């Protein structure tokens, strides 16, 4: 069987230092990570396990990649992120007895596994002090036929509401701070739970609906960049016919290659920016899908 895990290169400003952990079970030095709990998304697992193992909270930025290796039971699949420490301090735990903070070249030496070393090379290849734009497709909301009444008003269904609730921890893992949604009830409702958590209002965005994108895709592009330019990490909840077009455009111009792709309801594109420039685009499946 495949064991799914997530973790990070945890970093702080000293130029940058990264955490390497020691485990007496293997007398090994490695990166903080662990297994996904039932129902848990990779980002949320990563944040948890980082804090379990290092004693630090972190905000996840760019996704580093996936690595896969044999273990006695089968196969270990681990997703890694760059993650900046937001606080805390190490104290020894059950698995991890020591942690060191190292500049990257020394950390590469301290590491011992090829997969960890690969992830660390991925970390250094781009800027890590990134800002993050979270582009979310609204949750499940039945079919446009099944709900007559102004389709603008069609609500999230039971699943979609559960997706919205699950997106709170997902989006908070990336340090979401400001909320925007296309002018459709289902788009707002997707991020209402996060709005309440953050105690933030949701900015309504008539230029980012499907109808508006179809009429004037250029105004949508410009408005996306306007939003991305504001301070904070914005969530922008919009629709299925809008997202691929915006993401594809921006990735092509920035020469950013996504490691994964898709467009499902409740999915999230994590766009990482350095000094306003796009440097990563990471598609996350819906929180209730694999």
Ligand X SMILES: Nc1nc2c([nH]c(=O)n2[C@H]2C[C@H](O)[C@@H](COP(=O)(O)OP(=O)(O)OP(=O)(O)O)O2)c(=O)[nH]1
Annotated binding site for Mg(2+): 33, 49, 53, 95
237-259: buried (b, 16+ CB within 10 Å) or exposed (e) per residue? bbbeebbeebbeebbeeeebebe
245 binds Mg ion (CB under 5 A): no
- C-beta neighbour count of 36 within 10 angstroms: 20
> What 3 state SS string does 202-226 have?
EEEEHHHCHHHHHHCHHHHHHHHHH
* Count of residues engaged in binding Mg ion, rule: CB under 5 A: 1
30 binds ligand X (CB under 6 A): yes
Residues 4, 12, 22, 34: which binds ligand X (CB under 6 A)? 34
In this structure, the strands spanning 56-71 and 74-88 are antiparallel
Report the partner that residue 120 touches, choosing among Mg ion, ligand X, Cl ion, none (CB closer than 5 to 8 A by kind): none
Report the partner that residue 89 touches, choosing among Mg ion, ligand X, Cl ion, none (CB closer than 5 to 8 A by kind): Cl ion
Helix axes 185-198, 158-172, angle to 10 degrees: 40
170 binds ligand X (CB under 6 A): no
Q: According to CB under 5 A, which residues from 69 to 98 bind Cl ion?
A: 89-90
* Residue least distant from Cl ion (Cβ): 90
35 binds ligand X (CB under 6 A): yes
193 binds Mg ion (CB under 5 A): no
List C-alpha distances in Å: 40 to 34, 88, 139, 154.
12, 23, 17, 28
Sole window of 2-10, 120-128, 133-141, 254-262 interacting with Cl ion (rule: CB under 5 A): 133-141
Give min distance, CB of 116 to ligand X, in A: 4
Residues 12, 22, 34, 108: which binds Mg ion (CB under 5 A)? 34
3-31: buried (b, 16+ CB within 10 Å) or exposed (e) per residue? ebbbbbbbbeeeebbbbbbbbeeeeebbb
Give min distance, CB of 32 to Cl ion, in A: 12
90 binds ligand X (CB under 6 A): no
Strand (E) or helix (H) holding 192 = helix 185-198
Residues 1, 39, 71, 143: which binds ligand X (CB under 6 A)? 71
Asked if residues 284 and 267 have their Cβ atoms less than 8 Å apart, the reply is yes
Give min distance, CB of 41 to ligand X, in A: 16
User: Which positions touch Cl ion (CB under 5 A)?
Assistant: 89-90, 141
Which residue ranges make up the site for Mg ion (CB under 5 A)?
Answer: 34
């Amino acid at each position: 069987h495949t064991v799914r895990a997530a973790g990070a290169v945890l970093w702080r400003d000293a130029t940058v230092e990264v955490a390497v952990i020691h485990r007496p079970r293997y007398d090994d030095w490695s990166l903080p990570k662990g297994k996904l709990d039932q129902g848990e998304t990779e980002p949320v697992a990563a944040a948890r396990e980082i804090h379990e193992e290092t004693g630090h909270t972190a905000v996840l930025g760019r996704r580093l990649g996936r690595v896969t290796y044999p273990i006695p039971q089968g196969t270990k699949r681990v997703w890694y992120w760059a993650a900046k420490s937001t606080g805390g301090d190490f104290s020894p735990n059950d698995e991890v007895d020591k942690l060191v903070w190292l500049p990257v070249d020394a950390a590469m030496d301290q590491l011992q596994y090829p997969d960890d070393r690969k992830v660390l090379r991925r970390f250094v290849k781009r800027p890590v002090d990134t800002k993050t734009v979270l582009v979310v497709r609204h949750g499940t909301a039945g079919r446009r036929s099944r709900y007559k009444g102004d389709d603008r008003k069609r609500p999230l269904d039971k699943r979609g509401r559960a997706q919205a609730e699950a997106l709170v921890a997902q989006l908070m893992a990336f340090g979401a701070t400001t909320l925007y949604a296309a002018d459709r009830v289902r788009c707002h409702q997707t991020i209402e739970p996060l709005a309440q958590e953050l105690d933030q209002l949701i900015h309504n965005e008539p230029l980012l609906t499907e109808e508006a994108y179809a009429a004037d895709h250029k105004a949508a592009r410009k408005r996306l960049l306007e939003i991305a330019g504001r301070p904070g990490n914005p969530v922008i909840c919009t629709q299925g016919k809008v997202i691929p077009g915006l993401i594809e455009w921006w990735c092509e111009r920035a020469k950013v290659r996504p490691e994964t792709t898709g467009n499902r309801k409740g999915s999230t594109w994590v766009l990482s920016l350095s000094d306003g420039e796009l440097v990563g685009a990471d598609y996350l499946s819906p929180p209730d899908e694999k």
